């Protein structure tokens, strides 16, 4: 993936 919402 590109973009990991889980770290934000």
């Amino acid at each position: 993936a590109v973009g990991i919402g889980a770290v934000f």
């Epitope: 993936a1 590109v2 973009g3 990991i4 919402g5 889980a6 770290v7 934000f8």
Partner: antibody, heavy 121, light 110 residues
């Protein structure tokens, strides 16, 4: 970039240990999310768990939580997977993967080639 | 939390649409929507095609496109050829656990 290493064959109920060697950059980078993913032969993809920067930000698939542990070794630039009490359902190709946490970093991920692990006596 | 996506028989040169439905909205409070599409050709590791609903990854040809909203998403191949045969997976990275759809196999109809 990424290369998985495994034992080949694990006996049922024993523990599977895998390592992923990271190159081209440090595994401690805050630019990436590092995951273990697996695929039993002829089946779909399953996320095992992942890590952001260090051992204080590890998460697991609920279906594997309590049976898997993931760790990091910054000295070797590696991260690893330990899966206990393995059954034939754990026979699979195991992949490590690097995801940029933002497209601002770059617009591609990287998948290891994967390593087959077979659970059998 | 689960994503819902099976075989698609496609005449060559014709368009294909692959659907993905999520049990939860994939819209993050930061405004981004964390849904991605992969293609796995037989004997290969998966390759990222579309990240964050609609963006092609580096080097991905323009015959692939993505669209969607909240819980409903669609991957489109404009003109299907032999190199597009394989299994297409959607994935969400909104929250842990990260999750994959079950896959949609594309086969050429003849």
């Amino acid at each position: 970039q990424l290369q998985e290493s495994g034992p080949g064959v694990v006996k049922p109920s024993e523990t599977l240990s895998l390592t992923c060697a990271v190159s081209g950059g440090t595994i401690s980078s805050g630019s990436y999310y590092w995951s273990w993913i697996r695929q039993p032969p002829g089946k779909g993809l399953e996320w095992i768990g992942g890590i952001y920067i260090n051992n204080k930000s590890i998460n697991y698939n609920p279906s594997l939580r309590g049976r898997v542990t993931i760790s990091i070794d910054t000295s070797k630039n590696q991260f690893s997977l330990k899966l206990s009490a393995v059954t034939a359902a754990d026979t699979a190709v195991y992949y490590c993967r690097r995801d940029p946490i933002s497209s601002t970093i770059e617009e591609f991920d990287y998948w290891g080639q994967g390593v087959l692990v077979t659970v059998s006596s | 939390i689960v994503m819902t996506q099976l075989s698609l028989s496609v005449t060559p040169g014709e368009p294909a649409s692959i659907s993905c439905r999520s049990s939860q909205s994939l819209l993050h409070s930061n405004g981004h929507t964390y849904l991605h599409w992969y293609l796995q050709k037989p004997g290969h590791s998966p390759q990222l095609l579309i990240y964050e609903v609609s963006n092609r990854a580096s080097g991905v040809p323009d015959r692939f496109s993505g669209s969607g909203s909240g819980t409903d998403f669609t991957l489109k191949i404009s003109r299907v050829e032999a190199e597009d045969v394989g299994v297409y997976y959607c994935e969400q990275t909104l929250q842990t656990p990260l999750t994959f759809g079950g896959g949609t196999r594309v086969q050429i109809k003849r």
